[PDB]
Amino acid sequence: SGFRKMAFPSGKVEGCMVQVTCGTTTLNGLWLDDVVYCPRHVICTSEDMLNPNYEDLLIRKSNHNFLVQAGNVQLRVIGHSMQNCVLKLKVDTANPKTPKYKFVRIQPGQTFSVLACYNGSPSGVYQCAMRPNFTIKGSFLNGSCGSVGFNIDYDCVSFCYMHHMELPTGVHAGTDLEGNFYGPFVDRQTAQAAGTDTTITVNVLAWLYAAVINGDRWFLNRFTTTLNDFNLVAMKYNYEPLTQDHVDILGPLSAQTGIAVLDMCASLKELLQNGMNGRTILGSALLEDEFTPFDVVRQCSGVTF
Amino acid sequence: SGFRKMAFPSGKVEGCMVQVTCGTTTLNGLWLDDVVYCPRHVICTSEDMLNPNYEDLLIRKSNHNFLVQAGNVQLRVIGHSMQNCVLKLKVDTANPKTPKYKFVRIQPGQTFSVLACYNGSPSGVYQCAMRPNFTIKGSFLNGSCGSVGFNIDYDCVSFCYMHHMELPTGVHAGTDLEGNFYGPFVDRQTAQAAGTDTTITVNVLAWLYAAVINGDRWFLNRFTTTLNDFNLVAMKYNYEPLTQDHVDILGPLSAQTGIAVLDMCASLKELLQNGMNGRTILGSALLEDEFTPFDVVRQCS
Numbered sequence: 078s079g080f081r082k083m084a085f086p087s088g089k090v091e092g093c094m095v096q097v098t099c100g101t102t103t104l105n106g107l108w109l110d111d112v113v114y115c116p117r118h119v120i121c122t123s124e125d126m127l128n129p130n131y132e133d134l135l136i137r138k139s140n141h142n143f144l145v146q147a148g149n150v151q152l153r154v155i156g157h158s159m160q161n162c163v164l165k166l167k168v169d170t171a172n173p174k175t176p177k178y179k180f181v182r183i184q185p186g187q188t189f190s191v192l193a194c195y196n197g198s199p200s201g202v203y204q205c206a207m208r209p210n211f212t213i214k215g216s217f218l219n220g221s222c223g224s225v226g227f228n229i230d231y232d233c234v235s236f237c238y239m240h241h242m243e244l245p246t247g248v249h250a251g252t253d254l255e256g257n258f259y260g261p262f263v264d265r266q267t268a269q270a271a272g273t274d275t276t277i278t279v280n281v282l283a284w285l286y287a288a289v290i291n292g293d294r295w296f297l298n299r300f301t302t303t304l305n306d307f308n309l310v311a312m313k314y315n316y317e318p319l320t321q322d323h324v325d326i327l328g329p330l331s332a333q334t335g336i337a338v339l340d341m342c343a344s345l346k347e348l349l350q351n352g353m354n355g356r357t358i359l360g361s362a363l364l365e366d367e368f369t370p371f372d373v374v375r376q377c378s379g380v381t382f
Numbered sequence: 383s384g385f386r387k388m389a390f391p392s393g394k395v396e397g398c399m400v401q402v403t404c405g406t407t408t409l410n411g412l413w414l415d416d417v418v419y420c421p422r423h424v425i426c427t428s429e430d431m432l433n434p435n436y437e438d439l440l441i442r443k444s445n446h447n448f449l450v451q452a453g454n455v456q457l458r459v460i461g462h463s464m465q466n467c468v469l470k471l472k473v474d475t476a477n478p479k480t481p482k483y484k485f486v487r488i489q490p491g492q493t494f495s496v497l498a499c500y501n502g503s504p505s506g507v508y509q510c511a512m513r514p515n516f517t518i519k520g521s522f523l524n525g526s527c528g529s530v531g532f533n534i535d536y537d538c539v540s541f542c543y544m545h546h547m548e549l550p551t552g553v554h555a556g557t558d559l560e561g562n563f564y565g566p567f568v569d570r571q572t573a574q575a576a577g578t579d580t581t582i583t584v585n586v587l588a589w590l591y592a593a594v595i596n597g598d599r600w601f602l603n604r605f606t607t608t609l610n611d612f613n614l615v616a617m618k619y620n621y622e623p624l625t626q627d628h629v630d631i632l633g634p635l636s637a638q639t640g641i642a643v644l645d646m647c648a649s650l651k652e653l654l655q656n657g658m659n660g661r662t663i664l665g666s667a668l669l670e671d672e673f674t675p676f677d678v679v680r681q682c683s
């Protein structure tokens with residue numbers, strides 16, 4: 078038993094991380110088959126980051142302007158192109174450690190593991206959630222751009238995130254591996270702010286089920302609430318509305334524990350109105366929302382990858 | 383910026399995990415060079431779990447009684463021995479993925495990463511701390527024995543934990559890689575319980591420094607405390623005593639932030655007295671104690 082914020086094993090991704098240098102800018106790249114992916118702002122100088130014209134900057138750079146280092150071996154770049162906010166560097170050698178992989182775009186509320194890297198070397202791994210405002214609450218220092226987020230399904234690595242920037246509140250913004258930003262952000266050093274962050278209601282409910290599974294049940298009650306009545310309360314506390322799809326997804330956990338979703342919603346509604354009253358749930362004094370229903374089933378059933 | 387409960391990348395350890403089967407028991411083993419390490423209770427029968435005589439049980443086994451599987455390949459066992467509560471299986475092949483590694487015994491309050499495994503396959507990685515009562519608050523299901531905890535420094539893996547058992551409160555007990563249990567626990571299914579769990583005070587203080595480094599100052603105050611007065615108060619909240627050694631260890635963070643250690647101790651005294659009053663610190667509504675001073679420096683710099 079027990080319940081922890083667990084990341085996917087990172088070995089398959091560690092074997093793809095490289096170092097990319099253009100001029101004085103050095104960050105991380107993702108080496109898959111014979112291509113290295115990295116943020117396009119690697120071609121910017123500290124002064125070109127204010128109002129960059131990436132079309133112009135890239136036209137002026139050549140293959141030799143890019144230095145790619147895989148460990149202590151330095152990869153010959155034979156071509157380069159741009160796809161949205163990611164730079165694609167062709168190298169003359171396929172990564173022999175390329176795993177089975179896909180590029181996937183995640184949606185808010187879905188979780189993934191972040192492999193934080195510096196100078197092409199992986200330093201740490203942690204589990205994150207894409208927030209409803211399309212930011213992530215990460216831990217990144219300078220030089221961490223190009224770090225990637227991923228999930229593992231069967232034996233396939235699904236890359237879903239590449240790190241690009243930090244917003245003034247200390248939260249982080251990035252793109253998918255096709256270079257499309259998550260959220261209304263741009264890769265420029267102009268004033269930007271994320272919208273109001275809301276709570277991922279379906280994930281909070283999944284975590285309450287995990288708590289029950291592990292024997293935490295002081296918060297349960299005899300009452301049930303309708304989806305419409307619950308949503309009236311949730312919107313007042315900056316909670317995401319719960320849809321019928323969300324209820325369906327919690328079905329498995331609802332059956333395993335014998336607690337109806339709308340009964341858990343009543344428990345959650347009361348927790349929102351009265352707080353937690355000096356009690357904790359699974360070792361937390363806050364309502365945790367970075368576990369999806371699948372995450373709970375996966376951890377409580379010992380799924381391996 | 384930001385602050386997260388961060389684990390080490392697990393690849394170097396993934397390449398060492400194998401499946402070990404003896405009789406009807408299947409669990410995880412650690413394959414380093416030409417030796418596979420696993421809990422010795424893999425040799426127990428369903429009736430031998432209360433008072434096993436492991437020396438006697440092992441004498442009765444032959445090399446072919448142990449089935450070791452690295453992926454879909456079977457490793458030939460050519461020898462076996464016991465070191466405390468760990469079984470050592472000699473195989474005819476050195477693991478080509480063996481990293482640089484050390485065996486280390488950690489002290490309470492020290493953190494490490496756990497690679498939870500089942501049937502020799504990794505399922506997840508998470509960061510843990512050795513609690514003052516010599517347990518860990520892990521996430522483990524049946525079949526997880528032999529999962530290991532580790533740190534990585536440079537490219538060297540320091541193995542510090544191997545998982546053996548769960549105690550009635552849902553907490554976990556295991557050994558170092560020399561087979562010596564952390565705490566007074568034994569690999570027998572006789573009644574055992576962990577002592578009262580206390581809070582790792584020095585780690586809470588390091589995390590408050592991390593909060594300041596990250597721009598949070600709302601919990602500070604104008605007071606200072608003596609070390610003795612702090613410990614008299616903290617022990618009333620089931621906090622571990624803070625020693626002068628702990629104060630010395632916080633010196634670097636005290637210098638980086640310009641906040642004296644005993645001044646931060648005064649802030650913690652007030653936080654214990656008032657709670658958080660609906661506020662959070664580094665995204666938590668509780669005082670977190672599973673980050674060491676070393677962890678804070680590494681993650682924040």
Ligand SMILES: */C(=C1/CCOC1=O)[C@H](C[C@@H]1CCCO1)NC(=O)[C@H](CC(C)C)NC(=O)[C@H](Cc1ccc(F)cc1)NC(=O)OCc1ccccc1
Pocket residue numbers: 078407408409410423426431522523524525526527528545546547548549550554568569570571572573574575
């Ligand atoms: C690892 C094993 C055992 C065989 O194959 C594996 O992979 C488990 C890990 C444990 C299960 C859940 C998470 O941690 N180890 C054991 O099952 C261990 C075997 C003993 C050391 C020979 N026994 C336990 O952990 C007991 C509790 C238990 C047993 C079975 C189970 F499925 C879950 C939990 N703990 C124990 O025996 O001592 C504590 C105790 C005993 C009696 C009264 C009060 C307390």
Ligand SMILES: CC(C)C[C@H](NC(=O)[C@H](Cc1ccc(F)cc1)NC(=O)OCc1ccccc1)C(=O)N[C@H](/C=C1\CCOC1=O)C[C@@H]1CCCO1
Pocket residue numbers: 102103104105118119121126217218219220221222223241242243244245249264265266267268269383
């Ligand atoms: C060209 C930009 C996109 C490079 C990028 N810029 C930013 O992240 C800045 C925030 C920042 C963070 C840490 C620093 F040390 C310096 C700057 N974002 C920003 O300016 O937002 C707009 C704004 C808002 C308010 C006032 C002014 C401007 C960048 O620095 N990426 C870093 C990585 C870099 C850039 C190139 O090589 C790297 O590794 C990752 C950072 C560090 C921590 C997490 O995000």
